[model samples]
Target: SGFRKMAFPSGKVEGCMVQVTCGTTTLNGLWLDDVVYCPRHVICTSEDMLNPNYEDLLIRKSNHNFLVQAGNVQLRVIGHSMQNCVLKLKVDTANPKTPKYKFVRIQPGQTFSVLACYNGSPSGVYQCAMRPNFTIKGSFLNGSSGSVGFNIDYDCVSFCYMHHMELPTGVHAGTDLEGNFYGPFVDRQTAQAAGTDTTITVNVLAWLYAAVINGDRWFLNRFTTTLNDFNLVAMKYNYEPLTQDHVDILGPLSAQTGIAVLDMCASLKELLQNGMNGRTILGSALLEDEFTPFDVVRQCSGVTFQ
Candidate 1:
């Protein structure tokens, strides 16, 4: 009927099995089923009378947007998006020197896959991002796209993430709107067989770090830099998105300028010099592939999510 939401502190219903966070709650006007479970935030049917216990509608149907593929040796992404609001997935190959990509749209229960090779690794890491929304952000039934920002059609999360195993491994990035996009890497030795040198990738990365530390005018003014013009001589090189003026594993000291800055990213430079086989200083950022937003809710309430 006419219910409303209310705020409640860390207290329990006199005789119910619930607890709650300190905030306006929906239980002020409802009955309590005190069973003494751990109290937490509440969800309710009525917003004005919203309570934490009444099974509020917390549907994240729009959640299919995020995804992460399992290890890219063969960088492959397995996504299940839009049982209704269908959208395509684009995966970036681990080839930093290239803006290469693969695209697809997946349905529940069905797995979409692609096979792409990387230039190499750590230098040959995966990368990806989703752009150009082609659908509505509202009910899946609506497919039209126009202005009226209120009911925007598509919500872009961007594909900053990608990784690679090109098994040697296919890959996706350490960050992105799409989590880590993955496809498969068939016969990775394909390039290695060609006698490609991976160590140079490390060398180039080292040089790039030295530049960053040296206070390259380019990085100082990130806005002035363009993908094509930047990198190791004619190459489209870039610092892993994780590296910034201050954000990085190297710690806060690296953020400082001058020769000292070089020491800041010394760990990163070393990793680059050492290649993927080196210590995984970045951890999952370098090797995450499962449990992404795209399919995290794949199965809930004993039902395959739509």
Candidate 2:
């Protein structure tokens, strides 16, 4: 029933599309994650690099402390038609003292793909700046004074589509001892070993689907609070509990057919537990079909493969 339309916009629309606006730079296009090593040149003022947002956009990295991708992050650069104009990206490696830089020489309408990686910290920073002496001309500048711009795209790399999200990290996903898959949160076995009730099936994947697909913050609190409370008991059994951020990130998704938001939160959990335990509380397919939208997103624009 819920599959006909969706409680929230399908991930196909939200995840597949990538459009960004930061300061004078604008990027709009279908998401693509390509690997190319083309160093072009463009002039950028030192002042433009000072803005945190500008730098963050130039060198996109994961915003969370945990939940990172373990793959290449492509930094696309299209050079202006101008002969002498060039673009430079300064990447800060681990040392920080010595920055590694690359150049994008603006050649007759050529696009360059620069690969980047996220440092292993939530607070870790990766900054890219446009070097000075950029000569604006032709359609590149139009009537505006914008210095830099980009168009982002990606593959169906699970959570990576959230931000042209193409990182392959342990935090974004991992496997349990049985080799079963799990998302950004702990697996059911972890809680089970911690003395969590076997009947109580907590689906972190479903929760994440809800958060990303649905913009509802109400369920977010419910997810964290419920898990946090459960973790309390797990901790008593000496099992490490999920941190608040992890629980919060693992949000709950849609309800069973015929049910609305009023009963969505509780209904979702019940349906998940029922399906996982092979119980027909509401007919397992009903719940499985409800999450079809999540699968579509995961297939077309998710990081599950990577």
Candidate 3:
């Protein structure tokens, strides 16, 4: 979760090492931790950069053999630990194929980044490798020793950009006016109103009853067919158009029936899935009654339309 830096004396140690010296009572309890070391470079001295005679540290092609001293080197942990609380050291190389670094178990008060060797090529690409870095085990942390793994040429920038999206999935059931369960259905009135911005409350109620009977699927495929046929018959007669008074009286009544149908369908689906098999009042009506466009006000008040 957090990181810190420490200093050490410069030396010729070719490979850095880590030691887990201290930690809580739980030894080897915590998990993955890593250390990396890279080449360092120095450009100017404190007194020379300000001097009038000072010139940039420049070297010719033949003088390239001189090693560039590593300075301000630090260590960081890319992963978290579970129990062990001490610090350890290891070597890191920059090869992707063959990792050249090692990991140290974390212990309380253990030093992590102890600086080591220097390279002559400061600006040239450097490789850092780790030992026990790659693990095919179940979890990210080492199960055997509670230590972290390592890999070569592992850069954080490579995994910086990622994202995900999700969509609705699965089938939803439908209901009817007398409160019965059926498949999905599209309430024609609602669909039509949604398409044309009309406010035919009566049609809305009729569709609600149909939805209650059919549910979503049946309503879409079968209920729509029945309603379209009724509409065709009405068109043939050139019957008087629905009036504002009719809409005012039927809209709310239809909505209430529609809601009832929806509730019934939901209940039926749940019951059927749980293995309930007895017939329901609405289900019986659906099996026996012929399809017809009944007025919502009459249906709500227990009256039959002429």
Report lDDT (CA) for all predictions: 0.21, 0.25, 0.23
Error of 2 at 96 (Å): 37
TM-score for each candidate, following the candidate numbering: 0.18, 0.20, 0.15
Ranking by TM-score: 2, 1, 3
Clashes of each: 76, 37, 52
TM-score pick, better of 1 and 3: 1
lDDT of 1 at 291: 17
Every candidate's CA RMSD: 23.3, 20.1, 29.8
Evaluate model 1: give its TM-score: 0.18
Q: What is the alpha-carbon lDDT for the whole of candidate 3? A: 0.23
Q: Give the distance in Å from residue 90's predicted Cα in candidate 3 to where it truly belongs.
A: 99
Off by over 4 Å in 3: 1-217, 220-233, 237-240, 257-306
